[PDB]
Nucleic acid binder design. Sequence first.
RNA 1: AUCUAUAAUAGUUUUUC
RNA 2: ACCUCUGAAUAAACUAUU
RNA 3: AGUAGUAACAAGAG
Lengths: 729, 103, 358, 724
Amino acid sequence: MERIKELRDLMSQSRTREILTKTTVDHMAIIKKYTSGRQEKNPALRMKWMMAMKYPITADKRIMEMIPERNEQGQTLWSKTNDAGSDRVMVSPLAVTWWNRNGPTTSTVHYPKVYKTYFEKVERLKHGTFGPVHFRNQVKIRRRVDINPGHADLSAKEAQDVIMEVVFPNEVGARILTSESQLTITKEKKKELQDCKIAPLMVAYMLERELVRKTRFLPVAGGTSSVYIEVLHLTQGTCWEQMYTPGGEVRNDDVDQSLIIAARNIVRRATVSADPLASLLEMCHSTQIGGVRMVDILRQNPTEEQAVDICKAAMGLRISSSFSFGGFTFKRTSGSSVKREEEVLTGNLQTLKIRVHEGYEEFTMVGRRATAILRKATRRLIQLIVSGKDEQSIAEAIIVAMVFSQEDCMIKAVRGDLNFVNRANQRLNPMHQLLRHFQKDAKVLFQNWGIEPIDNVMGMIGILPDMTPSTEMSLRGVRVSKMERVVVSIDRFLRVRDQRGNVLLSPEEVSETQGTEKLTITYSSSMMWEINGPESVLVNTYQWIIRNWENVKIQWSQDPTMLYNKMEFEPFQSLVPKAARGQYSGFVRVLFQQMRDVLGTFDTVQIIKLLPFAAAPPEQSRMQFSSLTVNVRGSGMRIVVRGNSPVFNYNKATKRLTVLGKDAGALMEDPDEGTAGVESAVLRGFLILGKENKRYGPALSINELSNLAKGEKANVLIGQGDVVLVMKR
Amino acid sequence: FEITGTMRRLADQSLPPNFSSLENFRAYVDGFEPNGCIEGKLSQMSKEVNARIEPFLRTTPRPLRLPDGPPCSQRSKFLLMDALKLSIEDPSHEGEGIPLYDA
Amino acid sequence: NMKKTSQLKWALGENMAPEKVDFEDCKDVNDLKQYDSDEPEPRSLACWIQSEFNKACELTDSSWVELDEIGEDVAPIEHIASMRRNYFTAEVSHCRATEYIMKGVYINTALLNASCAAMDDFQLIPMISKCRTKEGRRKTNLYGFIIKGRSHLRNDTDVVNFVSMEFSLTDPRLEPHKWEKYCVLEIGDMLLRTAVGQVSRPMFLYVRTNGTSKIKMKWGMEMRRCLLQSLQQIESMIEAESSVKEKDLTKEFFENKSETWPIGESPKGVEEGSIGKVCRTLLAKSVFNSLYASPQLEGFSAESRKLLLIVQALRDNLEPGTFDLEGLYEAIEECLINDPWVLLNASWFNSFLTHALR
Amino acid sequence: MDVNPTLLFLKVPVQNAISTTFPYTGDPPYSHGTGTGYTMDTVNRTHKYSEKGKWTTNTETGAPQLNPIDGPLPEDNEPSGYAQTDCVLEAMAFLEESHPGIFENSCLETMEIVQQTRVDKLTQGRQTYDWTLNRNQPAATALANTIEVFRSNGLTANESGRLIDFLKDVMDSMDKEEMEITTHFQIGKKKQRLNKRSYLIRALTLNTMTKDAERGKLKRRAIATPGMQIRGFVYFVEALARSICEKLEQSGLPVGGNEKKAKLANVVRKMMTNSQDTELSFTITGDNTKWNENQNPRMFLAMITYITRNQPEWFRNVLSIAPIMFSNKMARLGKGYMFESKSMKLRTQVPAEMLANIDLKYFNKSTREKIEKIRPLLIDGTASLSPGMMMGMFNMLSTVLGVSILNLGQKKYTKTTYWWDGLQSSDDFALIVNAPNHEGIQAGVDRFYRTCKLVGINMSKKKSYINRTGTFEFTSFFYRYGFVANFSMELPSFGVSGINESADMSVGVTVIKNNMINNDLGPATAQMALQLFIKDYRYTYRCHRGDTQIQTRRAFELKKLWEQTRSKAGLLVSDGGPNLYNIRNLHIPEVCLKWELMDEDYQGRLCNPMNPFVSNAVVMPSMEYDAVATTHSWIPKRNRSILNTSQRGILEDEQMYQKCCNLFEKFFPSSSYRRPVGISSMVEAMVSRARIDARIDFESGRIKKEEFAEIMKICSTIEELRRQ
RNA sequence: AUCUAUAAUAGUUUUUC
RNA sequence: ACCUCUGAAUAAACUAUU
RNA sequence: AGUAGUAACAAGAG
Ligand SMILES: *O[C@H]1[C@@H](O)[C@H](n2cnc3c(N)ncnc32)O[C@@H]1COP(=O)(O)OP(=O)(O)OP(=O)(O)OC[C@H]1O[C@@H](n2c[n+](C)c3c(=O)[nH]c(N)nc32)[C@H](O)[C@@H]1O
Ligand SMILES: [Mg+2]
């Protein structure tokens, strides 16, 4: 009634009637932003200039009745001058600080409810626990982290639609909530906010603070969850780490993810030790995940993962030999596999490397709405027997099975602009990208998969590409049907065998992906970086060599065997490719032996660079190496044997060794350093004498030096665009 | 969304020199296939259009040439190394008392 | 408010702006022409700016900044930060550059507040600073007086004229070229004591007409960021060493004074100073960047950064190569015109080239 | 001992002390007078770079237009705009061949964007050159004036609310024989009726001015403000260029911050890994000389034509309009000049529109030469500028062109032992060259330089250098085996931002936290920064501690509030309370940080929704950096300079606009939360909503039949008033 | 595992003779 | 002359916050 | 005069 009377009043005036008639709803936004021009260019200067004025602050005209014109000292609090383009009056800051001491008082009891997020921050800081401060060689990595967690199974647009449904039911337009998560959250918030006495706009902003996810790229070390990101300034520094645990309640999915990350790191590190089982146990007892001991989490966490199950089995716990893939819990009833990287060409003409599992295997798929039995061979689906609930559940199960099968048809079914790198050029998991692509639109995948006639066995139905229950022909190898932890023993080499004696898990089955933890992973031992990421592992390994250079040098001179067997090099050896560990070790050991027998050719930097590669059991081959590869976030990063490298660059001007762009420390020149330009640790069986010498014909390559014999000097294009004279001993 | 009238006339004058209508240029671009154009233009271009790299050795750089003229003069808003202060023992914090009284 | 006398009307540029007329009514005037838009007159580098910078880097006997309070320390990292901040504050509060910071902040704040409050008045503004002596007693200092002209400032570059009367003991006749803008009086005989006897020296008043704008006054009021600029770099160096040493080195740097950095030059050669010396030097450099801000400084910094990067690449054995190095030199030297600070920076760059390539 | 700060680099690498080379504590340089000299210099230089091109006279505007496309191949290393169209088309073709489907998918996304974008997208921005007033206006104000003029001239296709319909209206306006406008003077309204050529000159005109507060530049430079007619087309072209750039690994746009640094580092490391160990690698820290004064709108039209092959005609037309309008663009000369008579002691403003036929005796030598060079180009008070992209426009399309030139450096294209790749962001670039020896490196650099010359890109020799790969500079980011921190760049952000007390406190603490996270701001320096910010905040807002005797106008009120308070820690710093911030709680709003320390009555007064300083409820007015609104979230006064002009009716008009908008919000509660959409008028929408709501309330029994009948009667009265 | 909400404000980056 | 008014908003991308 | 620097301010408008 008041609204319609005010509208009738505005329609009676000539100008307001013109505005109301000639302005459409679309142009209402334009006229709402319409202004004469707020000449604001330097707000800091403008504020400093205005705070010297008598009345720099505007206020509503009610202040002339709510606040007196003058205070006790007679100072004026407001003036009758109106602000430009409005009926607001000009007031002094004295008016605001007078209100804060003499104004009417209301009940501020609903403020903690309306601003629950900020008071939640206050509570998390209040009940948080601070640990010691450790000064370390920090290696921060720019990654996408969430600063506002929002709701788990929601996006920004879905959260906005849910908010509109909850707060403005009659303004939702054509949107209908389809996701079951949206319906559940909508019902929950409608019941919780029933008979609420807050303004609807304020309620909408509360729900935005509560439900809308926000992620950003930040240079982050430690946990990437919101509770750790909000205190990232406090907990992480350039040279220090502050141990801290937020005081609130920790989400369990973050615990699961961090446990998976820690277990994978621990298992991969333990695989290279002499006794993997003891190393795994002592690492699991020394690991904390968000202020909680890892062993307790393992005892009370039902997470289906290979490394987590290996960690459980090492401690006598019962495991479920299962894993997750695309929202389903797989379990290998029978079969075996060996991973193998195979490059494939996508349907949209993209080249990528996919970890292909060889061998024949059988699986069972379990999901919240569907169940299936899967048999497969190398990149070939033998059969799939789905027994889902509705059409969409069976469709999702079929899509997941097709992606899992790694069928070349599935690869060639890719269309559109499907990206396999991050927006920051970070490599993504190809299988996850294929899943997300085919879960948006799978018509082309089903079309190109094929068809196959069914023989009507047991009455199991067929399925057509458009999701219909045919009885004559079905998708190739797909059939439709209708609707436990075990005690294990773990070997010395982390081989998990069932009570009967069959192998269930192995270290080779552990994923090679190097992820990051949602909750900060604290490791307490001599090497706090022993289960850290590859960048931290490399930097800290070379810094450990630098700091201990005196006794390491003495041991290298006297007893190299014990030096190569230091436990500190094992995290490094977990980065060297498994097939090349022995070759690199043997090559580097031969280089070191030649370096010892040729006095004066003592290059400190060469020894420091090549030492971590000698920690593996040596395999003797005649292959020459110009560079050694190290896996860093999936890409083999080479360390060039001669000269600097992206991983390892030594600066002679500063005497400062920089690894992956992180300072590792300054070396000190040895008296036995060779100030003569003679190198003996570059070629396996050839000693560098000097620069180019045209007397010995044209320059050749390192990979063609076998034909040379004893004393045959030659010129080799070893290194980055350099030719030097080498001789054979 | 059709380009007609004044917009068409402007479009007919927004082309390379050897095209008279936007339709002709569109037809040329639609049928365009790369046929050694860049290589031929590079061969035609004279060898004087190059980016020669001159090494920057330790003996390469020269000192900067400072201008010649009368010596520079002080321009700061207050004295820096020549300022004299008349001081009083006033147990008051920064900006408390009346500036004129303190002066 | 000072009386609008003839001497103040002249000194503050009263009625010096020409009458604003229409081009119709003055197009036939013989000498009517475009504003003088010539380049600045070149000036050569004099030795006094190096002495000014040397004096701005020194340690004073008084504490010049009284930093406010923060919350109580709870985290251990907060206690470590408080210890390091104690070292930083001990180094930075007793530096002449901090006195310049406080003096400039006070002067610019007073000028801007008077400019907004009294558009059409000549205000007398004393130059006041507060300090704590070595024995902790508060002390109020008077440097001189400032008279503000009219301040009907429309643009951010509009100039307000002021007259600066400042006490000094420096004889203007020893370096006359430095004081070309000043009229120096002799207003008294101050009694100083060197070791045991009272020495009588003349007390001079350096009077000049000067001007500033709203943007300059704002950036003078915000002069306390020089502390941040110096201290962030100092702490970056400290933490860079701590990262490879795996322990805090703040106390080792500030007390043991084992690690030194080349910070100056003597007739013997390059001289290296402690972490506190480097902190004071960087603070003085930032303060002088604030006091002598000019387009010449901006151009020189931006253009000489490239040459610094090229020299660094040469020192890293990265085989640097240029294409039009003479063009780069011309671009750098285009900015060296008449600003003493920029000319001193150019001399420093020449010294750096001499030392960095031998 | 003479103190030499520069000698610090003898031990500290330059990248690790790069903050010392940014003197960002003093005031930046400003421009004092006119920008006409710089604009004329830019026009003359742009035409000089293309002087060997073909001259034509535009049949629609009469402006002389210079066409450098397919001009003679250069014989020297001077800058030139003689881009070859076939070379640009071949670069586009090879870019499409190396990334199959990039243009098709980008066109699909851009078609969706074009079909869905609303007209109020044009209001996003500060200023738009209003052709109805021949000066800059706020973007919303310029759009409103343009829409009103179009409606008065029977151009009402924009009433759909879509941006493409507004562009159709612009195109239709181009064909009107006469466009009518309305002018104010000393305050009456006068109708002015432009002719076809005059309106066409106004619509193709970009305003010009000087750039104030620019760091690192000795001399000032000109900048441009696009008009209302071209903004939508530029938005659509930039949307297409953005779609293309998102799919390119070498692109430096549109990624910024830590994401940009991570992408650049990953791309550089991928290039290093792909490089063979037995070959040299060099990186070029490269700039381009006068990129925007040498690139031609005709080449952008060619690029858009190649990109939109096999697309619907309407999409190609709507994308092509922007380069076409940009190749016929005119430039406003600016304010003009001021003339000073020393003898008669007078000064006067000379408008830029008189420079066509003004006597040249007044001007000095350089300005006279500028005017003599530019007079043939002057038409209708503007300068004909056919070549060049004016200022800060089509940056991502420039990035696309640069990335295509970089992409030309694969071994499949070089067909030799050298190859190149690198990074591209608008005009700035970094180039990595690999070759078996130094001769190959030189050959690859030469080939890159000559190819850029072919496509009209001139590599600044005096601002570029080359060294072994591992250190470079790109878009002011300094890479030394990884991007280093640069604190001096963010140093001006510290301080009182000038919104209000609450917002400024939040900004200060958030800036300290962000610089701790990103720019390696140490904890001790963070505490000192907090102290300095608190000091500046207290001085700026006259809110020193209650227990001090700082004599300000606000000090008595703060003393009174301090005396009556029981728990002093609960008072905000704006109210004279103490500073409770430290490193651990930088992320917490002040009102929430000390909420439980406040007195009940003080807290009730501070957070009182019935207070006049901010427009069970809570305080609400656009609450940037203000989590909880208090009485300290006030709004300062607006500038009152408009009251002395003839545009002072805009104040009354915007007051009535705000009144109508608030009345509308009384009918559609979600309008403020989410922008409403609709072709119906405001009164019609409100009446329909009132009728449906009254019917529903009657049906559910919330109101009785008498009130329903009263609402229906008032609605009928409003409908009757609507027609008359 | 993925991950450019929308909008507003401020800040930052983006030079011929 | 009194009187009266007024102290001055480029583009794009990004970042931060709401 | 001074600020300042390629053009301005040294009050403007009514
Ligand atoms: O966030 C990561 C991880 O922590 C999270 N995750 C893992 N497990 C869980 C559980 N149990 N609950 C909640 N979240 C979980 O998912 C993310 C995994 O990321 P990433 O490590 O990059 O992927 P991963 O390396 O695990 O590979 P993925 O594609 O997800 O496959 C998982 C699992 O499936 C095995 N597998 C695939 N194929 C095609 C196989 C096959 O043909 N034969 C056999 N025997 N195994 C196959 C993968 O090798 C992994 O073992
Ligand atoms: Mg560059």
